[PDB]
Design goal:
Chains A, B, C: It catalyses: 5,10-methylenetetrahydromethanopterin + NADP(+) = 5,10-methenyl-5,6,7,8-tetrahydromethanopterin + NADPH; (6R)-5,10-methylene-5,6,7,8-tetrahydrofolate + NADP(+) = (6R)-5,10-methenyltetrahydrofolate + NADPH. Chains A, B, C: This is Bifunctional protein MdtA. Chains A, B, C: Pathway: One-carbon metabolism; formaldehyde degradation; formate from formaldehyde (H(4)MPT route): step 2/5. Chains A, B, C: InterPro entries: Aminoacid_DH-like_N_sf, Methyl-teptahyd_DH_N, Methyl-teptahyd_DH_N_sf, NAD(P)-bd_dom_sf, NAD-bd_H4MPT_DH. 3 copies of one chain form a homotrimer. In chain A, helix 4 (about 100-110) crosses helix 10. In chain A, the strands form 2 sheets. In chain A, strands 7-6-5-8-9-11-10 form a 7-stranded mixed beta sheet, with helices on both faces. A 5-stranded parallel beta sheet of chain A has the order 2-1-3-4-12, sandwiched between helices. Chain A starts with a strand and ends with a helix. By secondary structure, chain A is an alpha/beta fold. Chain A has 10 helices and 12 strands. In chain A, helix 3 (about 70-80) links the parallel strand 3 and strand 4. Chains in contact: A-B, A-C, B-C. The complex binds NADP nicotinamide-adenine-dinucleotide phosphate (NAP) (3 copies).
């Protein structure tokens, strides 16, 4: 049977980026839908579970995407709720590539760290967006003491509460309104991630270079000025007098390979569920 | 040339069910459109008839679907009306699966009856919907005496008139507003079909198992309480005393293979027209 | 990698005609979007330039189409504007088949004229539409002396100004408000093209067959009354006395083959820009 991927996007039209990667990952055909909601996705799912049987079923799979993570999460939950008994197919969630980007970034840092980050302090700057929250979640799951920062304490605390409930961890928040506060929050930390919006700087070279404790820095922003000063986007473990760095493009290379590999995995079984935990498990096997 | 199927759906977005079946039927690519109407479909059809010539033409085809049978029929007529001379391609109509469902059901019953039902009495309970109407048409074309029943003579006689004019047959109507009247209507019948809306019982175990004249019963409702009591939805010719029963899922298994086979036929010529009659002819071959 | 074509149509839904030709031109997959504007196309383009690298870049391409040429040009310019450095893919513009139609027409006439029209006079009747304007541009590029006519001088001059600025040529405009003026305008001309709206006659038989200077005539209107009287739409170099005629269908046959061949070119490099000039270059090779 041909491998058919059904793309459910919460935005008005399906993401072009997700279509290309889906095909390069092995889909024979991709059929996409926009404006997908928790109320209209059930009928679409029925079409994937009552049309093929047995080993044929694994050749159909579902991918959920779009620009708003919370919206994708509501659709993803409604998809899983429609399945019942043996009537199911594999599914994946990766709105705006946040799960694959956060998983690639954390896997690279944990590997470069020797394989463990337990008990160590980790700081995610501008960690209130989807990549920062998923990054905080995966680090916390690895045992690190995570502090999620943002300009305003309420938003920062809301993000940690959200992450804590979903992944059952205990991330703490902190307000850092300026570069100065951001320099302080970083003191005593062993790992520092900058998950800021595109084209903004958050931690100049001084701010991280003179902190004996810092082992690794990782930046998700690929547009200059970069989130971390003193490094290049292509950096991928590059040495900087003690500290090692991973730039956005070095992280991006793995994210792309990871996304492709997850798509292929969707067709090897009819019961895969790929959200942050499972995507990160695969990321560690590929880093 | 690649086998290209153009899917025209009357609902807001195209049916996922119809997409999977189309690829398993052999289409190389399926391009779908939602909110298709009798007015906008003409321009879509031009794209299928003026882009390929000669032997190439049979490699493009059209499929009309959606949840409303009436809307689908209006669009299908607009499609056939657009063709002119040699400028045409094969087309199929199967809104809400009404044609393939009714064709599989009748084909299975006629086969289990020995191959001929000429002159026998067949009763279709709640036969005023698309599935009941198409079933009555096909039975009447096979020569059976058909009585289409519903809660109000008004609507039942209109359903019968519609079928009679479209298929050139002579189905009669009858009013059965309650259990008792329903049980009464099946006396003396050889074949009984329940084509009621989903989740409703129309013929309890005690209304058919004690009528000697009845040879075969068939139910299209797959949601408990089933249309026929005393059987399982998966029954496919299972014997109950001296009678045989077909459950909605037993019928559905053939409906799926039939729907796949019809799509493949669309690419074997550029003049095929697959509506109830032709879909039924193929159903008999495969039953 | 699979050859992926992304279709951006300015209308509500993507053209069926453009999809079929795109597959016959060699695309492995076509993903179409409707309602595309200069504003929302940027995010779409990003998806085609950040998902593949190196030799895989050329396996993704863009096609802009739809019914309104002006809307299409705006989107096409926005697409080229999003590219930067090596981050780009091949792209093509053919809203309403205006580029492939004008290129096929001019190529056929130039070949029939011995391969050169330099220094000769070409008149384009009702040349204010997109087909008429593109035809005038290619003819002027061949060194012909071109006169673009229309019922009102201001509109005709605006058309020539547009063409002259865009292709850097020097087409002249003239007002021909009635039958008498159109007949006067072609006296002494060597080539006459009728690019009027569908179903209108612009050049009666007696208005061209008695003019000794006229060598070849071409008509883009396929709906009777044809733009040029006394010819058949299927004519493709048919001789009438000392003259050759090309009708709308004779021209359309090359347009179709040309459109297919252009799509194939898009995947041969990641820098192709298929607008009128490059499409005409290929038309000459194929006429
Ligand atoms: N290439 C890929 O495949 C890919 C995929 C996904 C993401 N990414 C990249 O990874 C990064 C993370 O994405 P994201 O979507 O999670 O980010 P986001 O939601 O756009 O922004 C992250 C946070 O940055 C903070 N911020 C915004 N403007 C700021 C300013 N002027 N000063 C200080 N803080 C500011 C906000 O935190 P507070 O308001 O709490 O301060 C915001 O929650 C982005 O740079 C994005 O480009 C790349
Ligand atoms: N799995 C598939 O591929 C597939 C495809 C199509 C259909 N189906 C199933 O097959 C059946 C037929 O579909 P359909 O669309 O023709 O049905 P429908 O139009 O939904 O219903 C059929 C008839 O049921 C009668 N009815 C409604 N409520 C009733 C009640 N409370 N008591 C008695 N009669 C009642 C009505 O007739 P009166 O008003 O005249 O009494 C109505 O015309 C359904 O169960 C449907 O789920 C399955
Ligand atoms: N088969 C294909 O692939 C294909 C594709 C595209 C176009 N075409 C055909 O080629 C032709 C050119 O298309 P187009 O889009 O450029 O045309 P258009 O924009 O529809 O019309 C061209 C010009 O015709 C003139 N006109 C309109 N009504 C007129 C009338 N009643 N009397 C005299 N002149 C009138 C107008 O010029 P003024 O107002 O300046 O006088 C108008 O600008 C059409 O016949 C079309 O069907 C075929």
């Amino acid at each position: 049977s041909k491998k058919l991927l059904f793309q459910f996007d919460t935005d008005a039209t399906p993401s072009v980026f997700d279509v290309v990667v889906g095909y390069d990952g092995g889909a024979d055909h991709i059929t996409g839908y926009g404006n997908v909601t928790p109320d209209n996705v059930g009928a679409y799912v029925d079409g994937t579970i009552y049309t093929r049987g047995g080993k044929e079923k694994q050749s159909t799979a579902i991918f959920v995407g779009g620009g708003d993570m919370a919206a994708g999460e509501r659709v993803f939950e409604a998809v899983k709720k429609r399945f019942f008994g043996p009537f199911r197919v594999s599914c994946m969630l990766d709105s705006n590539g946040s799960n694959t980007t956060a998983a690639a970034g954390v896997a690279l840092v944990v590997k470069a760290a020797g394989g463990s980050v337990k008990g160590k302090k980790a700081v995610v700057l501008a960690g209130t967006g989807p990549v920062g929250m998923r990054s905080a979640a995966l680090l916390a799951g690895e045992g690190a003491e995570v502090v999620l920062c943002g300009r305003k304490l309420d938003k920062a605390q809301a993000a940690a509460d959200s992450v804590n409930k979903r992944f059952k961890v205990n991330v703490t928040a902190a307000e850092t309104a300026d570069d100065a506060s951001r320099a302080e929050a970083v003191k005593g930390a062993h790992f520092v991630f900058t998950a800021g919006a595109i084209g903004l700087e958050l931690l100049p070279q001084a701010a991280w270079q003179n902190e004996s404790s810092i082992e690794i820095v990782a930046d998700y922003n690929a547009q200059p000025p970069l989130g971390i000063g003193g490094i290049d986007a292509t950096d991928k473990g590059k040495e900087y007098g003690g500290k090692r760095a991973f730039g956005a493009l070095g992280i991006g290379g793995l994210k792309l390979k990871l996304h492709r590999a997850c798509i292929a995995k969707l067709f090897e079984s009819s019961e895969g569920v790929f959200d942050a935990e499972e995507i990160y498990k695969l990321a560690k096997e590929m880093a």
